[PDB]
């Protein structure tokens, strides 16, 4: 048989890339593409926000003066930001903003390892002159989607539904390769769409490791 390789990784955009696997024969193309897509969409380790604490907001449904929208919309915007960490499995992000102006993710007082991949992601708009919002964002790694209602303390702590899923749209195409001399060889190109928290190469490699380890249930190395 033939062994697919990372022949090309077309980083077409900052968010989504186009990975290419070259050597595959009848069936392998579609089988491996569908398996990789299902593994990626099912369980990819993301680093979505899971817990937010506001300086002076009691609960999820209240509203502090000077903010354009409700605290609930602030939390839902926070869920949308794409953040990736390197060393720590758990990290706390502190956001301190003052004065009129949208509160983008760029002003988050990030640590050494944690970094925001989409600084333009707006969270809330401050409107009053003497309006300041100080939130402690708790961001932790995880796999899959776990809602805040199916997990596991102070009244001032706000829970946002976890969305640990770097990938959002995985599309694969199986087309004939351009090998030096052979037929019945197809190349698998995967148009994976990510929020920016995962490298497409390492995402594909980790999905393949998951698939290979899941096959070891009855097969030795």
């Amino acid at each position: 048989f033939l062994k697919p390789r990372l022949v090309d990784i077309e980083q077409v955009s900052s968010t989504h890339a186009k990975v290419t696997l070259e050597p595959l024969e009848r069936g392998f193309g579609h089988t491996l593409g569908n398996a990789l897509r299902r593994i990626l969409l099912s369980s990819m380790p993301g680093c979505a926000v899971t817990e937010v604490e506001i300086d002076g907001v009691l609960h999820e449904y209240s509203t502090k003066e000077g903010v354009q929208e409700d605290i609930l919309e602030i939390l839902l915007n926070l869920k949308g930001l794409a953040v990736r960490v390197q060393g720590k499995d758990e990290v706390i992000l502190t956001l301190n903003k003052s004065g009129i102006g949208p509160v983008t993710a760029a002003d988050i007082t990030h640590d050494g390892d944690v970094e925001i991949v989409k600084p333009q992601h707006v969270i809330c708009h401050l409107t009053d002159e003497n309006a300041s919002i100080s939130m402690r964002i708790k961001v932790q790694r995880g796999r899959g989607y776990v809602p805040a209602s199916t997990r596991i303390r102070p009244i001032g702590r706000l829970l946002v539904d976890a969305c640990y899923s770097p990938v959002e749209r995985i599309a694969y195409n199986v087309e004939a390769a351009r090998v030096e001399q052979r037929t019945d060889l197809d190349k698998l190109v995967i148009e994976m769409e990510t929020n920016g928290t995962i490298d497409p190469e390492e995402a594909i490699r980790r999905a393949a490791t998951i698939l290979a380890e899941q096959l070891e249930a009855f097969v030795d190395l």
């Binding site: 897509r37 099912s42 749209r169 599309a171 694969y172 148009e191 769409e193």
Partner: peptide, 14 residues
């Protein structure tokens, strides 16, 4: 139904 099980078009959007 999990998103991985959804019918997806050629563009991949489920």
């Amino acid at each position: 139904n999990p998103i991985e099980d959804m019918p997806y078009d050629e563009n991949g959007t489920p």
